[PDB]
């Protein structure tokens, strides 16, 4: 329909006649700045935005969006043989080319790639959805948002493979762009022509190319899936210089071109003219939980100082966590201790784990699943599962074929990936019988031993654990005791730092309090009125991260009394014969909480009153049935 000549001149004019003066100090050539940047051998891929091509022309402002495959290759050979501006031996490919001509069937300029171009639409055009890519999205560079899943690692793709007969020194060019091909016969040359002087040519990657070639799987948002449907997926082939531009768990926004795919093979199942398509892209601007929306890619001090001195309190950060009810204040703050932690060292070679793991016991209506489902959202890199929501292999590693290689590698479960954070579990008792050993193993941290292949199954899990389960028929029968009313492994009950049971007996005036508390969750969408300024989650995210980097010392001036505190601890529970267990690991636990609590001081000034809260914390953690 359109021409390849005046169009060529128009795009050259665009390349040159371009000093788009968006503001003051813009009187030079933007694409000419990019040109000399190519001349630096610094930049190797230009990104393009419609505003330039919005103001220049209109054809190719709408002509390239549907094809994207010709005008780019014209752009390629346009700039490939434009040398307006050394050194030769700097790039491994170019230095191998200059090896090969310093040593000295025409070479293409496709061999000397040496620079690329992508695109960048204007106004991430819109969030077009993986479902709605209907029968008009062939070739069109469409903007869409998806969800990442099951990423693999960088692989080198090939474009041009050269042989050499070794009898005529032939340097053949056998370029390839698909997946499969075959090389050429022994002598497809003229010196090595039908004349008998022929050997057999052989490949040399030296004067050949390779390319970054990453592959991942792409799953749906699970927010716009149909009402009675199931999540779908699509495949990625992110080429060029964007390999390693996604991670498992990034709500990414990918912009590229849909294309078809020919899985060449058996002409009956395949070869049915059914088009098992796939995707192509250039630009990965992940708008959710990536380098863009999350800064520091939290330690940036100046931007937060204005709010830092703007407030000075702790409980203000306390009840800002799940602030839609009232009650259970002392649980939330210590839970916030779980997010930070921050006690790391290598003392005497032995590494100490600083991830608190606590449970929730007793559930005649407490909102047990609420704190878990909330903090698993706010807590970056969280998960959630239940008793029969997953088998043992669902929690641990697994196996699956690999589209990158097919190595049949191991992929892990929820706990396999939630390390350096907190994996949430609910209703622990009915999880499984052998599962208790599976959670017994994390108490010797960074140790996930499996018998899947049963060889080593080594793995480094550095996760916390947010446990929560229910009592059996009844809730502390008048004669029953711990390990009697509960039917959990008491050895498992031993390996925690804080045990947490939540029992609510009738309180004739607290019920009306919560009734007016939660009923206002429904007439509107915000609980705390005019009594304190609960903090935004987003500022919470950085305010927690800044506290982590202190790693204070320990006060010897109170070490003399921390042991006395352990004395009164182990004695006032020991005054009776058969109270619940009181463990010798308490002194290894009390040290681990006061540190993270001082982390939010960011001061290395752990004080005598610092543990004064921890003492009552463990004090009430037990003796929860006295009244």
């Amino acid at each position: 329909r359109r021409d390849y000549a005046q169009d060529r001149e128009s795009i050259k004019t665009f390349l040159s006649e371009f000093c788009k003066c968006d503001d003051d100090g813009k009187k030079e050539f933007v694409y000419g700045s990019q040109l000399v940047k190519l001349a630096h051998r610094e930049q190797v891929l230009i990104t393009i935005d419609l505003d330039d091509l919005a103001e220049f022309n209109e054809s190719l402002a709408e002509a390239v969006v549907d094809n994207c495959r010709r005008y780019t290759s014209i752009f390629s050979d346009v700039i490939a043989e434009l040398l307006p501006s050394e050194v030769h031996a700097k790039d491994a490919l170019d230095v191998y080319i200059e090896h090969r001509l310093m040593m000295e069937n025409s070479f293409p300029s496709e061999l000397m790639k040496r620079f690329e171009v992508g695109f960048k639409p204007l106004s991430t055009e819109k969030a077009h959805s993986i479902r709605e890519v209907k029968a008009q999205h062939i070739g069109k560079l469409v903007t869409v948002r998806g969800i990442v899943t099951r990423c693999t690692e960088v692989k080198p793709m090939m474009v041009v493979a050269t042989y050499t007969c070794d009898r005529c020194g032939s340097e053949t060019y056998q370029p390839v762009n698909s997946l499969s091909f075959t090389p050429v016969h022994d002598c497809p040359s003229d010196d090595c022509r039908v004349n008998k002087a022929g050997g057999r040519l052989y490949l040399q990657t030296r004067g050949s190319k390779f390319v970054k070639f990453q592959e991942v799987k792409m799953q749906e948002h699970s927010d716009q899936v149909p009402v009675g449907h199931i999540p779908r997926s699509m495949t990625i082939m992110c080429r060029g210089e964007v390999t390693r531009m996604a991670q498992p768990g990034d709500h990414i926004v990918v912009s590229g071109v849909f294309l078809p795919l020919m899985r060449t093979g058996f002409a009956q199942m395949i070869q049915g003219l059914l088009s098992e398509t796939f995707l192509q892209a250039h630009r990965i601007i992940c708008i959710n939980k990536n380098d863009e929306i999350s800064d520091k890619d939290a330690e940036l001090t100046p931007e937060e100082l204005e709010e830092l001195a703007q407030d000075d309190f702790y409980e203000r950060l306390a009840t800002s966590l799940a602030p839609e009810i009232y009650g259970h204040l002392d649980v939330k703050k210590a839970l916030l201790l779980l997010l930070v932690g921050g006690v790391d060292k290598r003392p005497d070679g032995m590494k100490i784990r600083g991830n608190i793991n606590i449970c929730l016991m007793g559930d005649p209506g407490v909102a047990k699943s609420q704190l878990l489902g909330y903090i698993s959202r706010l807590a970056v890199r969280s998960q959630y599962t239940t008793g029969r929501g997953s088998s043992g292999v669902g929690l641990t590693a697994a196996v699956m074929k690999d589209p990158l290689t097919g190595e049949m590698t191991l992929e892990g479960g929820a706990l396999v990936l939630a390390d350096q954070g907190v994996c949430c579990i609910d209703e622990f008792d009915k999880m499984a019988d052998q599962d208790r050993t599976a959670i017994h193993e994390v108490m010797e941290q960074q140790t996930i031993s499996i018998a899947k292949a049963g060889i080593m199954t080594t793995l480094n899990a550095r996760v916390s654990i947010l446990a929560a389960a229910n009592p059996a028929f009844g809730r502390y029968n008048p004669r029953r005791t711990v390990e009697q009313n509960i039917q959990l492994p008491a050895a498992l009950l031993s390996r925690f730092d804080l045990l947490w049971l939540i029992q609510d007996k009738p309180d004739r005036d607290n019920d009306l309090r919560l009734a007016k508390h939660i009923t206002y969750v429904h007439s509107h969408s915000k609980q705390p009125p005019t009594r304190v300024k609960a903090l935004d989650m987003n500022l919470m995210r950085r305010y927690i991260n800044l506290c982590k980097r202190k790693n204070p010392t320990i006060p010897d001036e109170l070490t003399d009394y921390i042991v006395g505190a352990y004395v009164e601890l182990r004695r006032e529970a020991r005054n009776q014969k058969d109270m619940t267990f009181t463990s010798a690991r308490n002194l290894l636990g009390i040290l681990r909480l006061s540190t993270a609590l001082a982390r939010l001081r960011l001061s290395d000034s752990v004080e005598k009153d610092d543990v004064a809260e921890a003492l009552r914390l463990l004090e009430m953690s037990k003796d929860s049935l006295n009244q």
Partner: protein, 270 residues
């Protein structure tokens, strides 16, 4: 110059010889032993007073000289090494003329630096030098591999052989051909074979992506390095990105765009 190279064997030979002679254990006598002698004639004493072969180097010795040989050994190590072998065999005769000058020695360099770790790698470092580490996974059995065959006949006993270049062999109508008494007779037993074996490897320093399984690699083996180590150890690797295509189908002979990568065997670090 060799075809795809820009170097020469003799210059590297001479400069490595002078480097080993200009040597006072300087990597830890100049930089950091009551020995104002080369460690290398000392080591050939140690090799010959034992007659226990199999040297090793470290590439931090070769900083003291020109940094060029470090570069032109990083770029083309698969082509440069045996000149150092003949330098070693010259030092053999320099140490003792009537020595055991028929058993040959390796060379086991190491230590440029950690790249970052095995997760973060590129295409362009495709035939160059790496050293990363983690943990060992398996310990599998060894495999022969042909380099030449035996053959036969019935009249006059044409009892012959012919070897491999890498993948291309010849045969006339006979073996040791004269006058064409028969056609070609193949046996494949009375022959020479070389050891090799595959062993998988992990990444487990703390060079780990949080919430990620270790992306694992794989290593070949060669003769006196085969089951060099027992499993359940952290060991560093010294080797070269060494690639090969994949076979599309198998029912056909087409080949896939995905060249695979794996590391050859040079030296390990118990």
């Amino acid at each position: 110059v060799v075809w795809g190279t820009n170097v020469v064997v003799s210059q590297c030979k001479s400069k490595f010889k002078s480097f080993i002679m200009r040597f006072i254990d300087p990597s830890a006598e100049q930089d950091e032993i009551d020995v104002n002698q080369p460690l290398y004639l000392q080591k050939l004493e140690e090799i010959h007073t034992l007659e226990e072969p199999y040297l090793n180097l470290n590439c931090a010795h070769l900083k003291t000289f020109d940094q060029d040989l470090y570069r032109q050994l990083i770029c083309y190590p698969q082509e440069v090494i045996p000149g150092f072998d003949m330098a070693i065999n010259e030092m053999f005769f320099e140490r003792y003329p009537a020595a055991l000058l028929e058993h040959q020695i390796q060379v086991r360099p190491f230590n440029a630096d950690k790249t970052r770790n095995m997760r973060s790698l590129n295409p362009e470092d495709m035939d160059q030098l790496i050293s990363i580490s983690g943990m060992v996974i398996r310990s599998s059995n060894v495999i022969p591999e042909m380099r030449e065959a035996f053959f036969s006949c019935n009249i006059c006993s044409f009892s012959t052989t012919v070897e491999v270049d890498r993948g291309r062999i010849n045969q006339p109508t006979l073996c040791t051909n004269c006058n064409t008494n028969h056609c070609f007779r193949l046996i494949h037993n009375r022959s020479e074979f070389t050891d090799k074996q595959l062993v998988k490897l992990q990444e487990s320093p703390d060079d780990m992506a949080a919430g990620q399984t270790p992306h694992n690699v794989l290593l070949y083996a060669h003769n006196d390095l085969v089951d060099k180590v027992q499993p359940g150890d952290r060991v560093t690797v010294t080797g070269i990105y060494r690639a090969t295509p994949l076979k599309t189908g198998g029912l056909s002979s087409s080949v896939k765009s995905v060249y695979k990568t794996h590391v050859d065997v040079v030296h390990f670090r118990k």
